[PDB]
Amino acid sequence: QEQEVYIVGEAYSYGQGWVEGALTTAESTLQDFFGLPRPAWLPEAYQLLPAPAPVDIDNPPALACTDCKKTLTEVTEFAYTGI
Amino acid sequence: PLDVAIIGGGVSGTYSAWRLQEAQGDHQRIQLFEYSDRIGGRLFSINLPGLPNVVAEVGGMRWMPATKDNTGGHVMVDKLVGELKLESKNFPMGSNLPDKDPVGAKDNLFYLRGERFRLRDFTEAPDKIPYKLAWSERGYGPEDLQVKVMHNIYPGFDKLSLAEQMQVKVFGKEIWRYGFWDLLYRVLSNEGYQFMKDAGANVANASAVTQLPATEYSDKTVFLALKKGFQALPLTLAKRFAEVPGGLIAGEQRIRMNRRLASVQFSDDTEYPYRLHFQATRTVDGKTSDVPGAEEIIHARQVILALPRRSLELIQSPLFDDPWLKENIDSVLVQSAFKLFLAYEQPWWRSQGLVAGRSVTDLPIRQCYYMGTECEQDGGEKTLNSLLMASYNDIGTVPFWKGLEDGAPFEGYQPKSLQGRIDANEVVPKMQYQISEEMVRIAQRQVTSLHDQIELPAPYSAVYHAWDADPFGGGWHEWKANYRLDLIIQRMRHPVQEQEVYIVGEAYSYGQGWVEGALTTAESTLQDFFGLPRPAWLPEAYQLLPAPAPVDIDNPPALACTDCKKTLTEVTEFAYTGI
Amino acid sequence: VMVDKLVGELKLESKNFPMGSNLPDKDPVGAKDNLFYLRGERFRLRDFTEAPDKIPYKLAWSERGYGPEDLQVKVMHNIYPGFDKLSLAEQMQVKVFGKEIWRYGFWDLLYRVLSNEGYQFMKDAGANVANASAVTQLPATEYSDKTVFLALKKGFQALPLTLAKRF
Amino acid sequence: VMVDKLVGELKLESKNFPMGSNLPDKDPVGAKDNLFYLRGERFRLRDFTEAPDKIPYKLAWSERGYGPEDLQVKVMHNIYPGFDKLSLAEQMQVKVFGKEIWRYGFWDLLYRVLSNEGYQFMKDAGANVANASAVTQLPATEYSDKTVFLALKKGFQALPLTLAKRF
Ligand SMILES: Cc1cc2nc3c(=O)[nH]c(=O)nc-3n(C[C@H](O)[C@H](O)[C@H](O)COP(=O)(O)OP(=O)(O)OC[C@H]3O[C@@H](n4cnc5c(N)ncnc54)[C@H](O)[C@@H]3O)c2cc1C
């Protein structure tokens, strides 16, 4: 936090093994510690890096299932694919 | 000072009280006595922690809707449930997906003799079935095989009235004189019988007349359940019996829980000839024990014993010395039933292609039902918490599970959904039979084997119930061979002509194993010996109890075949189904 | 998205990166005829579903009839249904067999749910790393040769060169 | 010992109780040709070892090649080697899977060590009771049609009758 060295690239991205990983880390670091706006060509809808879980996830609050009917349907129909 | 004492807070008891109170309550003292602190008898519904909208039906769980013409299906249940404004839901026996051509039960599992196959393989891949069936028994599922067997014995047998079925002779003997297994031994290979038992419904020493009738299998067959659990039906009735306005006895005094009818004695009094001796009981954690002390004594004109066979046997009365009643109380077998529920945090089976209905195995667990996810229910919490039920009734498997009752209780674990809601030590409910850890480990291993998995998620909660001890003796009854069950059905409602004691309930009905049996016996007895009209909600088209055959059916007149062309066509086309 | 739009921005020409056949133009074979040679046996991709008896792995009865990718999808739904559709924050909180998923290595977690022959099959016919976090290896999608990929006509190195050139 | 010596004492005549054939007098067939008819299949006792492919139970690879009795011996040695040779007092102190053996029923203990098809095989081709104490059901001996049994020529009821007669 003290120093003004930044690390970008695929290595410590979410999109490892992709050029997308490298670009997303670079763009986020630029928007966050260099103050550059988001490019015109870059949509706002796109999340560059995944939001983290809380630092303390030991005994976390429950995950409320959003549209479980659709998830369970997808899962069962996938199973039917094999059968 | 009681005009009617009703013994038993099951569905037949509670229905009887409600009817009599709503009809004659203004001038008749009616009281309902129940052995335990719980109303419902063999209807018994619970919600496990984390599953507030997925009911675990430890007793009865579904009924067949009334037909359009109101002549078939469980008409009494369907219309009574309509009358009391209880909400019903579909009881699925398979998958609705894909919404275009629903798989139904076709993908549900079988694991028999070390082989795995799915239901669709009985017709699609009969080489997978590991039973050495006769050439003529291949290509049917177990149910369809039973239909074929029945048409072999007598074509269209299921479509005959009980009176005609009691006159049908096979291999020179009337069918009601055979036990199911003995009759099948004559027409079906040993491997066939083994196949029907294992992949299968039936009892081997029960009357062939009530076991043989079978229908063509169809996962499209519709069943209904109550959203609040089947126990809502008797509870509602009890609730509506103690809330009838008016009457000699005040609403809150009409139901007397925790009273075990110890005995019925005959008093010299002409007005109130029955002296009922009740023992007070207390119920702790679902277990009822006698409270030591005096017997409460009550006087009644009429008595309705809304009680199964074992319960009748535990009541002392000179009434039971009647030769007919002494002979015909033991005219029914009692089938023990056992249920195991396991609650999981996700429906691991949905990823295997399983949605509803049962998978079947020859492992001791026998059958597993997939019973529903909390989040997929109407107004259900946003939780993947799911319920699995296992059930067995077969005598041979019972000893296995019986040995696993001892040991440390299963404690479960507080699932994430319940964190900061329930206590960790309340995750596994306190029940009459407290599931042990060993039983849960072994059930989980057998469930894992059945689904062909290495390891499944562990259950966070469980419930075991046995319908075997007193007073129930078992889960349901079946007519024994060599008994004129058509005559016993009519007489047992009022067993001793002199006395004013009536017997109602599922035990000595035609519809044994169903709430419909209990309701039909109760309603007939009420219409016949209490004079109540038929309810408005109850159609006239529906026959409550089958008309009996003549007492002398030795050398009976011939049965004139009504539209034999249609029967023979049905029978032949059914045969084509297998071929 | 970043690559796609940045490539758009710098006016680099892209092309389809085919993963199979477009012929016959009516019903393209795709990757269905591409070869496998495993354990001395030859079969084609279509045989994972059309002819599963040709697959020379002694798979569990419940793991047959899937290609390697689809088998991984099935495994993931077995562990947690819809896991791939959760956010990273939710995936980091998912516990399996009493431990958070990000505390398992891929191979250790699979060992618990999939037969050894299953794992061997997914490795050989398969993407994955055995000691990598299960949270980033487990997410899988249904296989489809219709999945579209793009390449640069001048090669992917044209993207950094262009950038350097424009810097 | 008590029966044998008491029968000696009362001068009741005993005879061999054969469990198989004595012919041919050179190499007696014994029980090797006696029949089994299980699950629609026919085989003879000798086929448990001579032709195990004829046995129509899907036994584990490690349970094949034994007759039912020998399979029970194998199971018992798996649980505790030499268990049958221990005194009752020692057998009541033997713990398996963290519980004393006399706290298990036979079927529950076998469920842990033997496949379901194994149990089914031992019941069908087999002696045992499924809910009885494992301590008194588990002890088994190697099968041998050469095992000798005796009967009374006048029937076993001659023993109590004689006693009553001599009382
Ligand atoms: C496992 C299982 C599953 C079932 N599933 C279905 C199903 O899916 N569909 C269906 O339609 N039916 C089902 N049934 C059957 C249905 O539950 C019964 O047929 C019906 O509930 C019985 O009603 P009843 O009034 O005859 O008797 P019971 O329910 O037995 O009621 C008798 C009552 O009398 C009480 N009693 C006993 N002795 C005394 C005494 N001395 N004094 C006072 N009270 C006493 C008992 O405690 C009990 O409350 C099932 C049953 C079981 C066991």
Author numbering:
A (entry chain A): 512 to 594
B (entry chain A): 13 to 212, 216 to 594
C (entry chain A), D (entry chain A): 87 to 212, 216 to 256
Relevant lines from the article:
L-arginine oxidase (AROD, EC 1.4.3.25) is an oxidoreductase that catalyses the deamination of L-arginine, with flavin adenine dinucleotide (FAD) as a cofactor. Recently identified AROD from Pseudomonas sp. TPU 7192 (PT-AROD) demonstrates high selectivity for L-arginine. This enzyme is useful for accurate assays of L-arginine in biological samples.
Here, we report the structure of PT-AROD at a resolution of 2.3 Å by cryo-electron microscopy. PT-AROD adopts an octameric structure with D4 symmetry, which is consistent with its molecular weight in solution, estimated by mass photometry. Comparative analysis of this structure with that determined using X-ray crystallography reveals open and closed forms of the lid-like loop at the entrance to the substrate pocket.
